[PDB]
Amino acid sequence: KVFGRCELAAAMKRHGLDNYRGYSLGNWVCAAKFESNFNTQATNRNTDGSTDYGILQINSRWWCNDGRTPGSRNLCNIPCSALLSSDITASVNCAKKIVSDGNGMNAWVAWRNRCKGTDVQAWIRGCRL
Ligand SMILES: [Cl-]
């Protein structure tokens, strides 16, 4: 599923991401835009052999099991394919664990490079929330 901007904002808000660990909703929407272009089916392979999955590009090196990343952990205790669902529940629940781990949203390279320090409120502007 390819979400609309406001559609995703509302789904994320419903799932408790607004101001989660101090990160306003606009941060999460911005991250999803540049990580996956709002596409729940996005996948990308990394140099080390791990793969990033879903709307928030969660990495199989640490967070999910895809059966092909030897010596990796599965800290979210889920198969990576669960992160590709049209239902964003699994992605959100895992993102909450990631953002709580000490490094905040800096875990997401696109957030650090393209959202951090910008006017992220612009990403939820006009939305019915
Ligand atoms: Cl933080």
From Swiss-Prot:
GO cellular component terms, semicolon-separated: cytoplasm; endoplasmic reticulum; extracellular space
Record-linked Pfam families: Lys
Positions annotated as active site in the UniProt record: E35, D52
Keyword set includes Secreted: yes
UniProt-recorded Gene Ontology molecular function terms: beta-N-acetylglucosaminidase activity; identical protein binding; lysozyme activity
Catalytic reactions of this protein: Hydrolysis of (1->4)-beta-linkages between N-acetylmuramic acid and N-acetyl-D-glucosamine residues in a peptidoglycan and between N-acetyl-D-glucosamine residues in chitodextrins
Domain C-type lysozyme: 1-129
EC class (word): hydrolase
Tissue specificity: In the egg white and polymorphonuclear leukocytes.
Annotated family: Belongs to the glycosyl hydrolase 22 family.
Assembly and interaction partners: Monomer.
Protein name: Lysozyme C
Lineage, opening ranks: Eukaryota, Metazoa, Chordata, Craniata, Vertebrata
The encoding gene: LYZ
